[PDB]
Design a protein around this nucleic acid. Structure first.
Ligand SMILES: O=C(O)CCC(=O)C(=O)O
Ligand SMILES: [Mn+2]
Length: 200
DNA sequence: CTGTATAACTGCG
DNA sequence: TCGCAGTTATACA
C-alpha cells in the first residue's frame, strides 16, 4: 500500500519499508557508520549570508559526481555496506536506480531544513528522489509555490515515520516547496536519506 | 504600479 | 510553540 499524495502538480507516494526491529538496527548502523561534513563543507549561502546548516549533512555516491545547492558543493564519499543495502532495497521496490545519496541528520526537533525546491541542474530530468527516514518521526511539509500571495492552494503535511519511504516524482519539485519544520517537543534524532540520480 | 530566485535568519504575533 | 513576513556580508536573465 502506497499513500499516493496528490494535488495540482504534486506527485508523491509514501510507504513503510521496514518494521520496527529492522528499522532500529539500520538506524543504529547509520549512527555507528555515517560520516558528516564539518566547517567549510557545512555552510550555505542564502539571502546574501553564510550560515552553518541547522542539522548535519553527508554525501555518498559513485566517484566523480558532485552535488551543489545554495552555494555549497559536496563530493561523494565511497558507498558503504549499509547505504547500498538501503539503495538496493529501494531500487527493488521501485524499479528505479540511484547513484547518490544526501544524508541529513536532525539531532532533535530544533534541527530543521528550510523551505526549498530540489531544482538543481545535475539531477537527471524526470527521475525521482527517494526519501528514506529513520529514528524520530518528523513532520514534512509541502507548500505550493504560488501560495505564499497569488494562489490560495492549501499545504500538505505528513509525518515521516521510522523506516518510511517517501517518493518524490515529477513535477513535484518544479511546483512545490518542502521543509522539515522545527518541532520543539521532539527530543530524539532523525536520519534522512535522499537517494538521487545525478549526472555530469 | 509592476524582473525573478534565494535549503537561512531575525522579528514578529 | 508555531508559523509567517521580510529579507539580499546577491546572482542572475
Ligand atoms: O530530511 C528530510 O526529510 C528532507 C531532506 C530534503 O529536503 C533534502 O535533502 O533536500
Ligand atoms: Mn529537498
Amino acid at each position: 500500500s502506497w499513500r499516493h499524495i496528490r494535488a495540482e502538480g504534486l506527485d508523491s507516494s509514501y510507504t513503510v519499508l521496514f518494521g520496527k526491529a529492522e528499522a532500529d538496527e539500520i538506524f543504529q548502523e547509520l549512527e555507528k557508520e555515517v560520516e558528516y561534513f564539518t566547517g567549510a563543507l557545512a555552510r550555505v549561502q542564502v539571502f546574501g549570508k553564510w550560515h552553518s546548516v541547522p542539522r548535519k549533512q553527508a554525501t555518498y555516491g559513485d566517484a566523480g559526481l558532485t552535488y551543489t545547492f545554495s552555494g555549497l558543493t559536496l563530493s561523494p564519499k565511497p558507498w558503504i555496506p549499509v547505504l547500498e543495502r538501503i539503495r538496493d532495497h529501494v531500487s527493488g521496490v521501485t524499479g528505479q536506480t540511484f547513484n547518490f545519496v544526501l544524508i541529513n541528520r536532525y539531532k532533535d526537533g530544533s534541527d530543521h531544513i528550510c523551505e526549498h525546491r530540489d531544482d538543481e541542474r545535475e539531477l537527471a530530468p524526470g527521475s525521482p528522489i527517494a526519501s528514506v527516514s529513520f529514528g524520530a518521526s518528523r513532520d514534512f511539509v509541502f507548500r505550493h509555490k504560488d501560495s505564499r500571495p497569488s494562489r490560495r492552494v492549501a499545504v500538505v503535511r505528513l509525518p515521516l515515520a521510522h523506516g518510511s519511504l517517501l517518493m518524490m516524482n515529477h513535477p513535484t519539485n518544479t511546483h512545490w516547496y518542502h521543509s522539515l519544520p522545527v518541532r520543539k517537543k521532539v527530543l530524539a534524532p532523525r536520519v534522512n536519506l535522499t537517494f538521487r540520480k545525478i549526472l555530469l
